[PDB]
């Protein structure tokens, strides 16, 4: 786990991601249901990042996966979407922030990455999913 | 390269060897239900003989029951001139009460004719008998746990001249940490006296009479099942819901522990429930704890609210049999059977219980099984939600239906957050005295 | 197939499956795949239920044949309040393979015995055990000191109606179908019938057999009788039952209550193991007697 | 179960959903077959909601899933399609309304959500399937 | 569940699973599904490991219950150098089902015994055998001519510290954890303890039991001792072991080396099969003697 | 089973459906075949109905599934394609009509329906399959 | 088996079909492998017929499947592609014609058909696969 | 225990279950706490006898005995049962790994050193199923088990 | 592998599987994966057949190894009229693992015995039972009152050619390969050979063994002989058979027909169970005799 950097600045339009829950459920077949939640929290689970710049940006991006990545390190993630609460219901969010200001430490959900060449200097990679391990 | 048809081979071993790691029998399985696999149990010993080898195991028993014993330290034949020995027959382990009514090969010998010295086999470590001063004190064995009976200057004249097979009535009180707390008669009495006296006679009211001759021996079922788990090492054992008298059960050494206990689960029918880590042994009744309607079951795996299986008519055990021990007279293997009047055409299913019980009780038990095994044809396979998870694994469900409202005791609860149940049909009226006359 | 081979050797064939089960009661039920109600015998096969007909198996060995026969339960059909109460147990089937164009072109695949019926989710699934179900079971007597036969049996014929033995009286006070009050308790001994046949011949439980216990008359000939098991169908406090008398299956209860001690079919004396290995000691009683 | 709010007002064209019936069925291979249902109601089973507004609406929408949501709470649902009956047959609907005026309390059929960024201010999420648990 | 039914009958529930295992050593370990460290007893359940909680099964039969309980091994956790050496064998668990909002709303699903642990690929999988594991095993004595008990046992109490019997000396020369040099060999007989308990109470192998063999002192009281098996944790040539003396479990070795020949719990004479079927010939020795 | 109404009048272009048979078949591997028919009839098996009108038509259509539907009732079906015979071969159809004039009583082949909103007043649902239970 | 008629005349562009050979095969993992066929003929196996005419043609086409069809009858099939031999190799075809002049009696490879309505008079059905059973 | 392999952890192949070494430790409730024989006396009058070996820590249960019909002396029988009670507790651990055909000369009965980061525990192997990827069900075997027990006689 | 480790430790390897089976007849067959015909011994391995080589298994236990070895049957190959008739039964294989670049770099994976061969769909599938197939079978004699050995056996050596005992004559009239006319019937007794070896050494069934029964000569020395079983290959009414004489395996038929009553290897008298538990009554015959 690191505190190394946010990310390369570029993120394409389509960087999707939202919180998860396990919340297993029985669906009582002759009436309503009853369902349990063991979390009290949520994995933010950001997906579908895309790097799109010159090939000068690519070699600092492929080794972003490699050098400080490996598999098992932080690389605090920037959200385009210390405790934050959500007060728009009379309920509350009250979800903690271990890192400062929406920085949500994560890890990539990939055994490999796949960078493509689109033109003499175009570097693309279609997806880098994350799940924000604590 | 590809794989062969040892894909069937790796499906068995150890593909199915992992299962029974983590897990006549014709009537044994139905009485435990879906339940679990009924282990082979209680091939009853007829012609009790004493083998003097070194590979026979130490027996154990609870109450008035004959046991064969075996020879340990017999001296050489001594000719008076027409023979004499000095036997020592070791019956069973633990502190026992006294051994009376010895009968050898054949009918009966009077114990007053013998010179036997009985021993309790006390953990107090009884000293040497001094008849083993034939051997001398320096090599005299001094058996701690086992309860041996020596025999002194035994004339081999009336029974041939060979050694006869001796068999001994033994009374053994149930021991163990749960037994010393809550004392029953065998030490609870603390002086009864009141011998009626006032002298072929009037024994027709002995089964209903206040006096306690004979039946003072019989241990309560609570402590004997506590003795099993105590010897197995489970001291967390919970047994306050048991109500039975044992009267001379006997399992041998290396009888699996549980297979000795499983004969009692056929006789008195109790749950062996284990709600919590206490392993509650409660007596089985029809007392309904659930009251589910049909609207209150969960969505199962097979997407049926209640799968109801009715077993085959060709296998209903039309007539049931036992192999109990006589327990009043000369202890001998006997048999009673219960025959259902409509379908007597076949399906004999018998089993053998090695305990000792009386005559009206045996016809009561087989009358109970023949009713239960035909009641326990119906099994239900439903899933109930974890909103009511307090249905323990041995409880019984009312289970209101549009057509029937038939009770169900449950087995094989597998939950993972969705309690899925293999029940079995159980009625309340099965568990009653049959009220039969005696012999 | 029996001389439909002319129909069958042509690729153009039309054999639609169909079967009839005869219940333990005298009524039969009809089932067919043909989707139109058809009959050849007086059975009136209905395609409203039954009939998935999955994979009849065979074997030269004594092991049974099997067919799970998935279907539907309905008010015209089995209806499952009939099935749960104790009917359809030894139900005998014949599966047929009729030509629906001409039902005189048919045969029997097997005649079965319908062992295991699993009903659920608004449907039923009923394993059709083969012809050889009875083989594979234990039948025998074990020399036990009781009797061995039932009252109606050939080994002990009784003429069970020969006097005022049977209690023919109509029922009242059915309660939870185990207790039965019975208005006409009076007419017999207390605890007369303790192992008898409670054949109920009217109403809901029609021709249904239970076994009695606890024949006790509390006041003015009430005769409150328990049973071992539920009847499975509730009697309606107006049904007629008849109860044959109770046999304890013992020599004393045989000859005293009943006259038929001749037809005993039991083994009263049966000396024992300890007698067998006993050698005769020349002491005490060694004269000829009962050994009892 | 809550009574908190309807929803964000925006719903895209394509918000699908209609009643779901157990309809346990036997399918006799002969021909005609019988069937029965144990509900006597119908789970309305609305799907395919889409939030589309500015990013100011997104942070009150992502914590709508989180704060009063979790998994197991009401958030009464607005239908663009006290007892209502349906009299267009000679049979009847006679279906109850526990909440007032078509408000059908539900829950989302998702372990996670997935909000996307499509431009400097565009917030999108493709689906939020519900089932109106009683 | 024990009076959380008010919490549980509502569909809004929040019961997060959690369990504690107590090792054979006095320490316990904590495990929870809740993803936040919580405690109710002094256990401090950690969500850093353990906890997949797959499908606890049940049965009225004596057969055990089971739960495979997939998880993770780490330095705070089991760490698998602890597990492989011989710990966690008879580890006792309780699984709980706590409310994480209020941990006073909990019960026990079962109390287990954790039989089979399969670790691999950086994780562990540990079958939780049920409460009834001890049933299903053979326990008995077979009248064999040795003894039958261990030294500390109730059937042969010894007071194993009563004199200079135990060898308390600290260890040197551990080599391959089977050979042990032992600086303080001198103080006892050669080959004094041949079946003893090598309890090692310091360092890496803390409270770990092995069995001795080949108690030989080579020069100046070295006392090189082998063991049957590896300890599984390497002692560090500074640990303290104590070795209880060796019992050959024989009458001669009982009474000579030890005083406790009274508490024998063994069967020395035990004549034999050929004695039993023998009839007494009237030739040679037929006077009363040892038969040995 | 009802005799309630035909249907809403609207049906989109693409309402597909044609008769079925089981007619199980062995395909004798070294020559020709032989095959059996247990029906003597055919399930007409109409599929792919689409309602397309205003939202005023939708509430009389969603409860068409619900009110007289449930699952297990008739709602006689109108075919855009008393015994009718087919004489264009020298064989014959001779297929019965329990209802009058091509009205083929059916049931919907759905546990749920799925009505969509396409515009302020557009109501669409893509499919309602039927099989014509007797 | 019939001799009833060819078919409706119309067949759309795309009526595919060609001979099907058992070709039992061993595929030795070494290399070359042997094979044999037990037919000495070839099932012609025509597929993808399409009827496209007015709705007047449809009712004589839907009962073509039903009346003389059922499942198990001939309806001799017209090929747009008495013994015919093929002499373009020095081998020979020598394949028989039980029916006259390319008429190849078949059966449809369908439990059901699916006729669609595409406009006031348009009748379409996408496929009727046959296999020319002898 | 003569080791023929000397594998490091880096030198195993990719198995089926995608674990380099699956290591199974058997249940404590079934470890055979006391073992028994039924040998024949072989010096005196040939009679069935029995010796047992009891592990001092866990004597609480799991009696596991077998019967051998051969004839052998008194110190040898206590030597054999002393060997089984040590071996059956050693052979609790089994390993299930796959090793590449680059070293296929590991015959089906050889024993592997198997260096790990934590332990370096030997393993004798069984049930080799290769097809071009030797996959192994090993079992834990120590060298010191196979020695004379050096006991006194009768 | 035997010193191809230098070839094998490199990742660049090229070991192509190949095996030879030796039939019960002297010919061998060759099989390889290499797709080019190669040989190292005089076997000429052909890739035209055989060789899928699926998953040889092993075990320290006595249980066999197995390999199903999918392949193809053809006229050069096994051809399955050879296989069905009774050849390839105890066929012995060696599987090899040769380098096709250099066939001197090879070893044996196992030497098998090819137990179960399942042929179908124009292919064959042949389970290669391991080296330990013979273990796992019952071998013994049960003291029965017949003989126990075959004629050629070491326990009864006979010199089966020593006189005019064998019938060497060439065959005519093969009919359905059970009846055999035999032109030269005359030369021997009627019913001389009733349990003999019909070794046929020419033509189709080359070296194939059947057993005779019903040695009857009908007219002018025809000697029509049946067999128990079909030969599996039709003899062509010109083949040469030789038939060794028939042994009834009985003491009377031993010493009369054959001289070799010394080498009996049988148990004629063998008194019985009822003799064993009998006590000697002092009545009737109690003098020394045959007890027969
Ligand atoms: S007592 Fe008599 S009537 Fe009754 S069963 Fe026995 S023999 Fe039959
Ligand atoms: S020799 Fe004595 S101390 Fe040692 S085990 Fe035997 S009885 Fe116990
Ligand atoms: S009869 Fe003679 S030759 Fe024939 S098998 Fe017997 S011993 Fe051998």
Residue numbers in the entry:
A (entry chain A), D (entry chain B), F (entry chain A), G (entry chain B): 2 to 82, 157 to 209
B (entry chain D): 2 to 24, 38 to 95, 112 to 229, 745 to 984
C (entry chain C), E (entry chain C), I (entry chain C): 4 to 295
H (entry chain D): 831 to 984
Task: Provide the authors' original text about this structure.
The structure of the RcGTA baseplate with imposed threefold symmetry has been determined to a resolution of 4.0 Å. The core of the RcGTA baseplate, formed by the hub (Rcc01696, g13) and multi-domain protein designated megatron (Rcc01698, g15) proteins, is decorated with tail fibers. The hub protein can be divided into attachment (residues 1-142), ion-binding, oligosaccharide-binding (168–249), and clip domains (264–296). The structure of the megatron protein is composed of iris/penetration (residues 1–46), adhesin-like (47–229), peripheral (230–744), central (745–984), and fiber-binding (985–1304) domains. The iris/penetration domain of the megatron protein contains α-helix 1 (residues 7–16), an extended loop, disordered region (22–37), and α-helix 2 (38–46). Helices α1 from three megatron proteins form an iris-like constriction that blocks the central channel of the RcGTA tail. Attachment of the RcGTA baseplate to the tail is enabled by the binding of the attachment domain of the hub protein and central domain of the megatron protein to the N-terminal Ala2, long loops, and C-terminal Arg209 of the distal tail proteins. The mismatch between the six-fold symmetry of the tail and threefold symmetry of the baseplate is resolved by the different conformations of residues from the long loops of odd and even subunits of distal tail proteins, which enable them to interact with hub and megatron proteins, respectively. The trimers of hub and megatron proteins form a compact complex with a buried surface area of the interaction interface of 3550 Å2. The native baseplate of RcGTA does not contain the space necessary to shift the α-helices 1 away from the pore.
